[PDB]
PDB file of C-alpha atoms and ligand atoms in Angstrom:
ATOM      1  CA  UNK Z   1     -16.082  -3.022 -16.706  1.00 29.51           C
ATOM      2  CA  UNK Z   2     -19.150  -5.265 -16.770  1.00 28.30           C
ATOM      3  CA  UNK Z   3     -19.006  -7.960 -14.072  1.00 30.39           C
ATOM      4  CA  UNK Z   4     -20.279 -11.730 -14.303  1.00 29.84           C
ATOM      5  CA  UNK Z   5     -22.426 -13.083 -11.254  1.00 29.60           C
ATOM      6  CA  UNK Z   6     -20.338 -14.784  -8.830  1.00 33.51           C
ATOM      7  CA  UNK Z   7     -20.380 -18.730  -7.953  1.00 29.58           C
ATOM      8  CA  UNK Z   8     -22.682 -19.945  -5.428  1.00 30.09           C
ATOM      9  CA  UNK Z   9     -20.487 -19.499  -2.352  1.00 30.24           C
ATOM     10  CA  UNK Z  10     -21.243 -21.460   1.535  1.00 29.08           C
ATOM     11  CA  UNK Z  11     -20.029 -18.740   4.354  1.00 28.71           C
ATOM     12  CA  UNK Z  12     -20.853 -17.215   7.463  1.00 30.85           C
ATOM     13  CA  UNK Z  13     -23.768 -14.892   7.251  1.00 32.23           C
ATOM     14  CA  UNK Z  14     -22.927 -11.375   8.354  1.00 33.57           C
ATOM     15  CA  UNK Z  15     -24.029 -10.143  11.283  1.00 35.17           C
ATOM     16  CA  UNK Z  16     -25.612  -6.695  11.159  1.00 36.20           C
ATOM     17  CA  UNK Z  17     -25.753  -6.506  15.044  1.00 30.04           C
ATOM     18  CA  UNK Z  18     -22.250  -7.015  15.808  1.00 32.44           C
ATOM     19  CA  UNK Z  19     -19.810  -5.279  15.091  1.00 28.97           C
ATOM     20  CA  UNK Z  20     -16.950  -6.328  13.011  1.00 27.56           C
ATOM     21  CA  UNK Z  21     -13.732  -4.960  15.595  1.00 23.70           C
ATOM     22  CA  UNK Z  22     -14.392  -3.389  18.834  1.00 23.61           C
ATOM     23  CA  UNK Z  23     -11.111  -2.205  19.672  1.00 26.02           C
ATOM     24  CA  UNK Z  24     -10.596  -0.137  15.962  1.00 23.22           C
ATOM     25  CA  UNK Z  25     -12.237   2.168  13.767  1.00 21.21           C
ATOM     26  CA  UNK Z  26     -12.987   0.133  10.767  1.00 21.26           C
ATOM     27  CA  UNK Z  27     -14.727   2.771   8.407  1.00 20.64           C
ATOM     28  CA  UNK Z  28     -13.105   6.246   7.157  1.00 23.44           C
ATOM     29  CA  UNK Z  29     -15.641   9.685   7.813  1.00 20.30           C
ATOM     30  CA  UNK Z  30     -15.411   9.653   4.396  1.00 23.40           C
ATOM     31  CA  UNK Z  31     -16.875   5.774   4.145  1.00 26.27           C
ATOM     32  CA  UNK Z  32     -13.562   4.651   3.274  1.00 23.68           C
ATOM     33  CA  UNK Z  33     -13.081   1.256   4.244  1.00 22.87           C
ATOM     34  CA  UNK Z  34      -9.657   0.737   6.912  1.00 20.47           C
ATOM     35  CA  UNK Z  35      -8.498  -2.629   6.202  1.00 21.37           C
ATOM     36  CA  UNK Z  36      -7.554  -5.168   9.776  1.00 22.35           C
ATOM     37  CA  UNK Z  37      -7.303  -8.427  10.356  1.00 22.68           C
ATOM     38  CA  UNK Z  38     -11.519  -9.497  10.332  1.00 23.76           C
ATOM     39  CA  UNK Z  39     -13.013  -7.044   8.509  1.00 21.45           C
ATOM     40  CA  UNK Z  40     -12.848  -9.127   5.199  1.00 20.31           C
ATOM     41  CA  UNK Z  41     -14.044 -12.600   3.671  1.00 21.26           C
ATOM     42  CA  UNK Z  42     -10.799 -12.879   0.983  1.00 19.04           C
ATOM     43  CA  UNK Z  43     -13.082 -15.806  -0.527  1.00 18.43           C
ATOM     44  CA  UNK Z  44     -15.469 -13.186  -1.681  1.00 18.73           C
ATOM     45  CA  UNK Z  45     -13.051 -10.649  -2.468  1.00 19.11           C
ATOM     46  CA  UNK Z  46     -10.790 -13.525  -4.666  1.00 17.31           C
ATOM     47  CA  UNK Z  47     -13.290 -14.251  -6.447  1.00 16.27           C
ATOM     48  CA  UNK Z  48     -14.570 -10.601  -7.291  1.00 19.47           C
ATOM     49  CA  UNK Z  49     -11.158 -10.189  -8.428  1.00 20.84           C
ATOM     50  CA  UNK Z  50     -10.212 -13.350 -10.649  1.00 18.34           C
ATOM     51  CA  UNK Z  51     -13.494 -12.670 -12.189  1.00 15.67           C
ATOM     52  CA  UNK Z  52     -11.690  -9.622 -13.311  1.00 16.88           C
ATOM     53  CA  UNK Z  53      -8.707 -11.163 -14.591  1.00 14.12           C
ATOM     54  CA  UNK Z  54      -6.927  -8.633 -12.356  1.00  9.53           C
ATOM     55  CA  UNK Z  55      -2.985  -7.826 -12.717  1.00  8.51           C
ATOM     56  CA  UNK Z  56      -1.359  -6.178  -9.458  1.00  6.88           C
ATOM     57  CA  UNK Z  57       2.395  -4.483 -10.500  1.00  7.68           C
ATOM     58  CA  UNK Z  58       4.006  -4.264  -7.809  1.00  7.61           C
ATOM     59  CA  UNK Z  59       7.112  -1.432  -7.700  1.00  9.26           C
ATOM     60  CA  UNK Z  60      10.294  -1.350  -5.728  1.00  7.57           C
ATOM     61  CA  UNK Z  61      12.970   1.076  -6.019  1.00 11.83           C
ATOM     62  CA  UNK Z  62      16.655  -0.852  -4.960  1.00 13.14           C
ATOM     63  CA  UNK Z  63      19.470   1.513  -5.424  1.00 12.82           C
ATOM     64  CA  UNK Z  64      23.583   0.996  -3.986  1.00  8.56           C
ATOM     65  CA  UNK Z  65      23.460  -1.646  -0.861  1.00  9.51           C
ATOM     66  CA  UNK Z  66      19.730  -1.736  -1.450  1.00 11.45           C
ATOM     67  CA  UNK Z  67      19.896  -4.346  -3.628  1.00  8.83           C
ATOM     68  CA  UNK Z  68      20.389  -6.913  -1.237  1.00 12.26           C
ATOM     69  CA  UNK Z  69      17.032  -6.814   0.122  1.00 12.50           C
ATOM     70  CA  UNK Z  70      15.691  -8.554  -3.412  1.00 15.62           C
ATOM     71  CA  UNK Z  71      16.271 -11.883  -2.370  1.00 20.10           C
ATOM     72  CA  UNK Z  72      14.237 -11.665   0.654  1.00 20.87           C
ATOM     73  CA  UNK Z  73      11.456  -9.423  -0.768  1.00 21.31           C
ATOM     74  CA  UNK Z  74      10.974 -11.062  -3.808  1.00 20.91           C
ATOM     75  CA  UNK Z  75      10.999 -14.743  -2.478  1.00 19.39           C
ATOM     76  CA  UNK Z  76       8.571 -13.900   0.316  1.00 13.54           C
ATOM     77  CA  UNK Z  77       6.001 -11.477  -1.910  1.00 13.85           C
ATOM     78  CA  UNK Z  78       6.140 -15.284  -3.495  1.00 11.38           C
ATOM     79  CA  UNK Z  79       4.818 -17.094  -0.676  1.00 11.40           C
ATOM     80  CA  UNK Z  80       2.411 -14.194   0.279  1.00 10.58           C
ATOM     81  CA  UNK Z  81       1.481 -11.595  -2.448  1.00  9.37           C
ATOM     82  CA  UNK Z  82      -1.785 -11.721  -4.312  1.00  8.77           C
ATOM     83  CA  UNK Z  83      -0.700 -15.368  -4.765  1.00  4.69           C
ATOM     84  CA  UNK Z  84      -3.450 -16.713  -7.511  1.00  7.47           C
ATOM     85  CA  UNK Z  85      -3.729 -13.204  -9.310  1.00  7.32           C
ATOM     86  CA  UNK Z  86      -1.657 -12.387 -11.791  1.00  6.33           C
ATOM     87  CA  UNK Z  87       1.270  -9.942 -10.552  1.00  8.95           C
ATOM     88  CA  UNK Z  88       3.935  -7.884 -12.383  1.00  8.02           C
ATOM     89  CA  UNK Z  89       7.152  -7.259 -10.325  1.00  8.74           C
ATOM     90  CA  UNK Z  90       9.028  -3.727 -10.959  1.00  4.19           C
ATOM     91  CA  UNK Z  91      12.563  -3.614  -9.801  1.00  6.86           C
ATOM     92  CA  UNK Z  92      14.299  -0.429 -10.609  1.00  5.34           C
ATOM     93  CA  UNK Z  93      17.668  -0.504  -9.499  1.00  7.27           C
ATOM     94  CA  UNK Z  94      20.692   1.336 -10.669  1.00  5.07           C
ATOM     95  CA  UNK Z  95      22.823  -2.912 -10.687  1.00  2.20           C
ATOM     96  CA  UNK Z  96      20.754  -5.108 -13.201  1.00  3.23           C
ATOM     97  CA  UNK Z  97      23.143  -7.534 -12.868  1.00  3.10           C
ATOM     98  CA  UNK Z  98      22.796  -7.365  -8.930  1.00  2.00           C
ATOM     99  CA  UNK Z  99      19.033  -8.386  -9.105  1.00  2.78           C
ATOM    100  CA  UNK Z 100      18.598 -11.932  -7.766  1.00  2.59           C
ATOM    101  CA  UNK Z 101      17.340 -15.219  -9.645  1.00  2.00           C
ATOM    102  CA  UNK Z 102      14.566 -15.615  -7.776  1.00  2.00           C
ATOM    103  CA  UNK Z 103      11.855 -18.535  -8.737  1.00  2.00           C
ATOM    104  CA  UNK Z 104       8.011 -17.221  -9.729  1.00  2.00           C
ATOM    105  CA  UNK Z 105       4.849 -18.368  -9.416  1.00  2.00           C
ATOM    106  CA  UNK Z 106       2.796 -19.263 -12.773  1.00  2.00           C
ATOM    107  CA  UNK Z 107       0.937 -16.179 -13.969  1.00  2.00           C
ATOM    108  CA  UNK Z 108       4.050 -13.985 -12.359  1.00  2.00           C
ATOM    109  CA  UNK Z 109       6.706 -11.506 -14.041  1.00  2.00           C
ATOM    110  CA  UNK Z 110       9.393  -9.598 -12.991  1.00  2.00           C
ATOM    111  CA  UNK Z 111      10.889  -6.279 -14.799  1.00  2.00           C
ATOM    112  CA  UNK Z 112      14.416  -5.323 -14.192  1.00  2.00           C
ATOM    113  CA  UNK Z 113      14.290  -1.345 -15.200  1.00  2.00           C
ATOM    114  CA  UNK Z 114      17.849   0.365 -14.939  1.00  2.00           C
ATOM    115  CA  UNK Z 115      17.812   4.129 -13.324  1.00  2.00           C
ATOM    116  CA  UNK Z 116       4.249   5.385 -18.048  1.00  2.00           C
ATOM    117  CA  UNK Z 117       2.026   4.166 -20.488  1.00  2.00           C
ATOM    118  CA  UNK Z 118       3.752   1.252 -20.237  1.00  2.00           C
ATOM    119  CA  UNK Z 119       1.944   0.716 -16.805  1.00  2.00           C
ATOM    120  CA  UNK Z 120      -1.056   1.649 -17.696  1.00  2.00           C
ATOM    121  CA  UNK Z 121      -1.419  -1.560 -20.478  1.00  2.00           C
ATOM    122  CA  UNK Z 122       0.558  -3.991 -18.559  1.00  2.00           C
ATOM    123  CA  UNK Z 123      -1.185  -3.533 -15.509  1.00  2.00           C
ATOM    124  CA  UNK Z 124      -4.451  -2.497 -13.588  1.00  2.00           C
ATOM    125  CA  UNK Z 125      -3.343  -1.702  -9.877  1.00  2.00           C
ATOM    126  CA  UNK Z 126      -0.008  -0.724  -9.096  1.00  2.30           C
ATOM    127  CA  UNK Z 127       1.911  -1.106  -5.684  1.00  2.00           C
ATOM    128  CA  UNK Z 128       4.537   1.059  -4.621  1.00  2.00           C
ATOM    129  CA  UNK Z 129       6.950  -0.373  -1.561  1.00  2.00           C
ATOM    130  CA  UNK Z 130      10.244  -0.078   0.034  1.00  2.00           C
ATOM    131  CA  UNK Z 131      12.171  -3.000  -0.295  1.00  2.00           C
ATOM    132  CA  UNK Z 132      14.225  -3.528   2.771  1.00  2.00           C
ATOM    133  CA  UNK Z 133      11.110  -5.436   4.229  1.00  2.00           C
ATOM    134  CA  UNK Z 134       9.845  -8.869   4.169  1.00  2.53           C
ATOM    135  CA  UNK Z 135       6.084  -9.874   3.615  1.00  3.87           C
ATOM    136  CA  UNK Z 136       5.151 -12.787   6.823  1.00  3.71           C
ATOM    137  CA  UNK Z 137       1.721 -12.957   6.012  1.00  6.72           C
ATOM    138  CA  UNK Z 138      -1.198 -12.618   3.573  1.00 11.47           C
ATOM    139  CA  UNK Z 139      -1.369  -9.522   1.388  1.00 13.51           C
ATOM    140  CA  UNK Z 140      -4.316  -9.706  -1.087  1.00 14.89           C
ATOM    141  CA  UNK Z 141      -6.707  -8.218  -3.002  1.00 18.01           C
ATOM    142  CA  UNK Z 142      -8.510  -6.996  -0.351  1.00 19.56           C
ATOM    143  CA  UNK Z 143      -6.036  -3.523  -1.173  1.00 19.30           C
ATOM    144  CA  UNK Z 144      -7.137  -2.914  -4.187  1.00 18.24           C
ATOM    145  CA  UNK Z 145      -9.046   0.211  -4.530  1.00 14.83           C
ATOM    146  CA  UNK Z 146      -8.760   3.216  -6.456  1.00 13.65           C
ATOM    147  CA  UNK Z 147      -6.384   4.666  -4.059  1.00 14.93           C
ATOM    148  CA  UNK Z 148      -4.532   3.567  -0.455  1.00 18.95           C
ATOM    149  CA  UNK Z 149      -2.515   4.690   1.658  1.00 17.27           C
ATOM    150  CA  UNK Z 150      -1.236   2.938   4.812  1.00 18.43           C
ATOM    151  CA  UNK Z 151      -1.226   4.300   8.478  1.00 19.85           C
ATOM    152  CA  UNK Z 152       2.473   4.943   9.569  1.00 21.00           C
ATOM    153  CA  UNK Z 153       2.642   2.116  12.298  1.00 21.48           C
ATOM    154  CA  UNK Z 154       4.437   4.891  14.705  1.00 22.08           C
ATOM    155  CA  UNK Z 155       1.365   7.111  14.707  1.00 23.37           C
ATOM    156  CA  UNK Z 156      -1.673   5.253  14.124  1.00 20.57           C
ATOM    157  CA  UNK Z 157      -3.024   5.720  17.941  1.00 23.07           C
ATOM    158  CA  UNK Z 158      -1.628   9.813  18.594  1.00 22.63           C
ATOM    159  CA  UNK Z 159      -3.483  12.901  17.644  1.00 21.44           C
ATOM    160  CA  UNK Z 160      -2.808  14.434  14.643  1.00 22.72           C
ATOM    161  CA  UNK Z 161      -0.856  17.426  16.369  1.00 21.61           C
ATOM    162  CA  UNK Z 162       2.111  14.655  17.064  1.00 23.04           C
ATOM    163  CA  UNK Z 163       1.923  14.010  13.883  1.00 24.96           C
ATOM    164  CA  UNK Z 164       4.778  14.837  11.685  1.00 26.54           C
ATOM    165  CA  UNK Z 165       3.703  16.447   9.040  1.00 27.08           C
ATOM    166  CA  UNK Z 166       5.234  19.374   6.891  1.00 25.56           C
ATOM    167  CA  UNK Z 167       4.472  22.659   9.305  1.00 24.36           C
ATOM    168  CA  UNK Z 168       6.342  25.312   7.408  1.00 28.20           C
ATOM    169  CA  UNK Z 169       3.385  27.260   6.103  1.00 29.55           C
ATOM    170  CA  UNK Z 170       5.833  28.177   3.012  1.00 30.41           C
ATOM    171  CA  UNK Z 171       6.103  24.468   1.848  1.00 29.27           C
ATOM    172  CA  UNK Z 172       3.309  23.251  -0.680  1.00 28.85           C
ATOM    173  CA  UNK Z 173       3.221  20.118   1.943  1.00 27.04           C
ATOM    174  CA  UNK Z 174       2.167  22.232   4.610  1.00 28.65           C
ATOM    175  CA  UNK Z 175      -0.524  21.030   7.320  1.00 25.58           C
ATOM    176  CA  UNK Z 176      -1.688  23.363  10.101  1.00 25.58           C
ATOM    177  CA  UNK Z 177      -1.997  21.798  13.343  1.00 24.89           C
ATOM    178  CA  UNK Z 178      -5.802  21.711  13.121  1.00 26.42           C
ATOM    179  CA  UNK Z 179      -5.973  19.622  10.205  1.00 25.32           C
ATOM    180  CA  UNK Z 180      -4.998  16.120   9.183  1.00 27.03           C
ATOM    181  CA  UNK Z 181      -7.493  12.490   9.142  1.00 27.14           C
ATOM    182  CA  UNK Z 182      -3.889  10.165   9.838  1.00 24.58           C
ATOM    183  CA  UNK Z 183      -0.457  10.008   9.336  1.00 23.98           C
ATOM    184  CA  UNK Z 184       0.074   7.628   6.013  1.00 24.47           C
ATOM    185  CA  UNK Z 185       3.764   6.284   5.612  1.00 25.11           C
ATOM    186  CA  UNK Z 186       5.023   6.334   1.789  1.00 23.03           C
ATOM    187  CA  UNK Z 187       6.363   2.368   2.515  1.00 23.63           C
ATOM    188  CA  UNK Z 188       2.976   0.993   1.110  1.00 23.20           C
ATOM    189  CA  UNK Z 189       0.540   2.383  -0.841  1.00 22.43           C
ATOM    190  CA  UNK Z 190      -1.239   2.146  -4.082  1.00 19.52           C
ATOM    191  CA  UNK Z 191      -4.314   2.275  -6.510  1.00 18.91           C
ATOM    192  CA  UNK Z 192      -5.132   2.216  -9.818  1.00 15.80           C
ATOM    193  CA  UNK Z 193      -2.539   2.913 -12.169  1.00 11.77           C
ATOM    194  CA  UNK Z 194      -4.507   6.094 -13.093  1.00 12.49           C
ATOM    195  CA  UNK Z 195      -4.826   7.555  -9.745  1.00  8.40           C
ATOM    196  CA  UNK Z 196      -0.816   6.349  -8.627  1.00 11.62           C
ATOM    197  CA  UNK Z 197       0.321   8.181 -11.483  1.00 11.15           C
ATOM    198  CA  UNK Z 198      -1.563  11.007 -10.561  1.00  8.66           C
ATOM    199  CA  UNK Z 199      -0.499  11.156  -6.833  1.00  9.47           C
ATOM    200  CA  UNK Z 200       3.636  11.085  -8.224  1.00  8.82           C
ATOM    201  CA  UNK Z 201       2.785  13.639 -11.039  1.00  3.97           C
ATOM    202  CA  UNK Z 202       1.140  16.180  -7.953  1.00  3.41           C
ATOM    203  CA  UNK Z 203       4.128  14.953  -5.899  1.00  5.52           C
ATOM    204  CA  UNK Z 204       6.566  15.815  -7.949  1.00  5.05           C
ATOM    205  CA  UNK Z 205       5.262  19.236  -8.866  1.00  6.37           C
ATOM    206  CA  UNK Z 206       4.732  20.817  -5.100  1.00  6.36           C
ATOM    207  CA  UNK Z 207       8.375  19.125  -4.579  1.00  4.41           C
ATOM    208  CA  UNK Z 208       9.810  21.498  -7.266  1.00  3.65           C
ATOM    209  CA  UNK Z 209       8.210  23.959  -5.976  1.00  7.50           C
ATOM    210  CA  UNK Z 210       9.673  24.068  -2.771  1.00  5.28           C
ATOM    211  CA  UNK Z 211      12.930  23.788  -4.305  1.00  7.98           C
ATOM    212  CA  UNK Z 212      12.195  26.831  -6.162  1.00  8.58           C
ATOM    213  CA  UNK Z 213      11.242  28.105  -3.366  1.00  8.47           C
ATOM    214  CA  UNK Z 214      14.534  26.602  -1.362  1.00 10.34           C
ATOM    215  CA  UNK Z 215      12.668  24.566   1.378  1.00 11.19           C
ATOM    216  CA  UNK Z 216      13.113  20.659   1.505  1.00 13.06           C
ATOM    217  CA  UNK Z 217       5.942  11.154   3.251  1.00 12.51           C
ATOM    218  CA  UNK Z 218       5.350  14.807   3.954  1.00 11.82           C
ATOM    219  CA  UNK Z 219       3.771  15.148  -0.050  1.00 10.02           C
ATOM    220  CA  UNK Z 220       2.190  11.805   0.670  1.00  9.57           C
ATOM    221  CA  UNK Z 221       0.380  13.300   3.515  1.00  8.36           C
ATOM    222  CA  UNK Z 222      -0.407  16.664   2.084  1.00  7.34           C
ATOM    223  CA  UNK Z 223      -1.869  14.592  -1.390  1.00  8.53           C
ATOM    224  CA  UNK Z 224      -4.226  12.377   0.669  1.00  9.56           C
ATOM    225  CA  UNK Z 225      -5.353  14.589   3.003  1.00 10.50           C
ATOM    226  CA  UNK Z 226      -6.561  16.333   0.166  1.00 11.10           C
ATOM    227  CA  UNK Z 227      -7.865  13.827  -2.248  1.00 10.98           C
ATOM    228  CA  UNK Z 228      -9.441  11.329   0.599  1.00 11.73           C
ATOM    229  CA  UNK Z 229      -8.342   7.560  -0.157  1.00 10.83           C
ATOM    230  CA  UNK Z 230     -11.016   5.475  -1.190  1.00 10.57           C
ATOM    231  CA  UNK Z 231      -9.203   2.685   1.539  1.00 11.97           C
ATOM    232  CA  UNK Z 232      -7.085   3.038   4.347  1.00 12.09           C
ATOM    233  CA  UNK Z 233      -4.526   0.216   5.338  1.00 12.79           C
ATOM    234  CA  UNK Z 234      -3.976  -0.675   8.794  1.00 11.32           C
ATOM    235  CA  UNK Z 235      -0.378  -1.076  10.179  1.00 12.32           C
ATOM    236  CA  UNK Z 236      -0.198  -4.479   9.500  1.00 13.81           C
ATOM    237  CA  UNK Z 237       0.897  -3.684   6.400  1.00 15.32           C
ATOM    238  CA  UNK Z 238       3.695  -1.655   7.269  1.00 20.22           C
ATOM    239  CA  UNK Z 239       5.188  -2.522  10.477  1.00 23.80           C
ATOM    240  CA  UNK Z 240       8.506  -2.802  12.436  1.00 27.13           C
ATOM    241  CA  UNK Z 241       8.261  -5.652  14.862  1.00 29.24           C
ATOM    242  CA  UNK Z 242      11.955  -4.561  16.548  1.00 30.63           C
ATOM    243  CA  UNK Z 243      10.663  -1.366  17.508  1.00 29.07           C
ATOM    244  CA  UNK Z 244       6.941  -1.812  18.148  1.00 30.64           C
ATOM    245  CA  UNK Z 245       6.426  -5.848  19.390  1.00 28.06           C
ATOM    246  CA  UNK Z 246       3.235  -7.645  18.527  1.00 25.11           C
ATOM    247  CA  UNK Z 247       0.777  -5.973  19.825  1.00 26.36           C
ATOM    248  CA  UNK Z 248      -2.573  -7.314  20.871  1.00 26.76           C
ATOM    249  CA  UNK Z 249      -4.245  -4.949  18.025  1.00 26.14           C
ATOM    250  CA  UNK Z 250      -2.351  -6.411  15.481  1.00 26.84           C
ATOM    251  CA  UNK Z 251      -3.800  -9.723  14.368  1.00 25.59           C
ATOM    252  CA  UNK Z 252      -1.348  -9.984  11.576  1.00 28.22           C
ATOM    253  CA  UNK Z 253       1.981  -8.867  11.057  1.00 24.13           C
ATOM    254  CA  UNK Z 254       2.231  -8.809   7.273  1.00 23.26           C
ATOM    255  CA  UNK Z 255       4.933  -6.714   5.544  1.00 24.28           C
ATOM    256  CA  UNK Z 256       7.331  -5.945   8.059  1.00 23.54           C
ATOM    257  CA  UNK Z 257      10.612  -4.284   8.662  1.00 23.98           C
ATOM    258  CA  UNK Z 258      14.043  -6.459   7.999  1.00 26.92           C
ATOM    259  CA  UNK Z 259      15.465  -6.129  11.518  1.00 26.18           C
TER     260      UNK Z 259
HETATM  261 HG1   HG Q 301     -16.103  -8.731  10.922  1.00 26.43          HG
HETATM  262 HG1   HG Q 302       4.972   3.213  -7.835  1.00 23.82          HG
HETATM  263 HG1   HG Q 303       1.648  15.634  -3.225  1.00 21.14          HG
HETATM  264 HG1   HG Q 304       4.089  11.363  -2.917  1.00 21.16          HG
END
């Protein structure tokens, strides 16, 4: 919509002759910005975004033993979690009763839905994330976009014949060998509530298709390899410290695996 000036703001000019990261590709072919650790001033960005009056849903699914994660994710997407924007929490879970009490931030809801235009008045950006994970660090607004996906924290240095992809040229997820930009993991990604609900609605056709068809992250892959993402998320936001350390790379280790 239309957009007020910003505030006079005191920060570190930018410096067109160096580059931002040496060691990582910080810009998509497609001019798609990958999000790391330096790349962003989340001064700027906060304030782009409050000027907005921005609300971030975010969505977790938490079915059988599942539901024991809450606690954990809920308290620490507290601590770290667009914390000063105003966030809606999803939990669909097939125990109401089972979800935890956990204490919110001013400005922040939570949803218990037992197992569409609803989202779409409620909230302007939705986030879609497993919930046996806890957030350790900052995850802001610097996200938001009309559509992300986040590189697979497995994959994010091997060529795309490694990765794996659907390569059963009778599945509607199918990738030949030749093709692919990176290997996105379904664990974190998001957009506008627009272009999220068209990603699940294209999902959830070509997956009843292959049933049809009697073959069974794969659609994730196939969807954004096809409709680019408009910003890529580095593994920091979706990353298993038990099997993959700290590496010097990562900066930040933000929304991690519960070991
Ligand atoms: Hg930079
Ligand atoms: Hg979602
Ligand atoms: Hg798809
Ligand atoms: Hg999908």
């Amino acid at each position: 919509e239309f957009m007020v000036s910003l505030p006079r703001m005191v920060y570190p000019q930018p410096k067109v002759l160096t580059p931002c990261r040496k060691d990582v590709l910080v810009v998509t072919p497609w001019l798609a910005p990958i999000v790391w650790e330096g790349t962003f001033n989340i001064d700027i960005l906060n304030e782009q975004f409050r000027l907005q009056n921005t609300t971030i849903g975010l969505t977790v699914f938490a079915i059988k033993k599942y539901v024991a994660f809450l606690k954990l994710f809920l308290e620490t997407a507290e601590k770290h979690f667009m914390v000063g924007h105003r966030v809606h929490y999803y939990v669909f879970t097939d125990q109401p009763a089972a979800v935890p009490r956990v204490t919110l931030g001013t400005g922040r809801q939570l949803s218990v839905l037992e197992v569409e235009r609803r989202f779409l008045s409620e909230v302007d950006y939705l986030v879609c994330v497993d919930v046996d994970m806890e957030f350790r660090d900052h995850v802001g607004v610097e996200i938001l976009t009309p559509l992300f996906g986040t590189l697979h924290p497995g994959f994010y240095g091997s060529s795309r014949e490694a990765f794996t992809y659907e390569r059963r040229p009778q599945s509607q997820a199918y990738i030949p060998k030749d093709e692919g930009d990176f290997y996105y993991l379904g664990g974190f990604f998001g957009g506008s509530v627009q272009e999220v609900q068209r990603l699940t609605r294209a999902c959830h056709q070509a997956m009843m298709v292959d049933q049809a068809n009697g073959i069974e992250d794969s659609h994730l892959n196939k969807y954004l390899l096809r409709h680019k993402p408009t910003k890529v998320l580095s593994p920091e936001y979706l990353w298993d410290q038990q099997l993959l350390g700290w590496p010097a790379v990562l900066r930040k280790l933000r929304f991690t695996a519960v070991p």
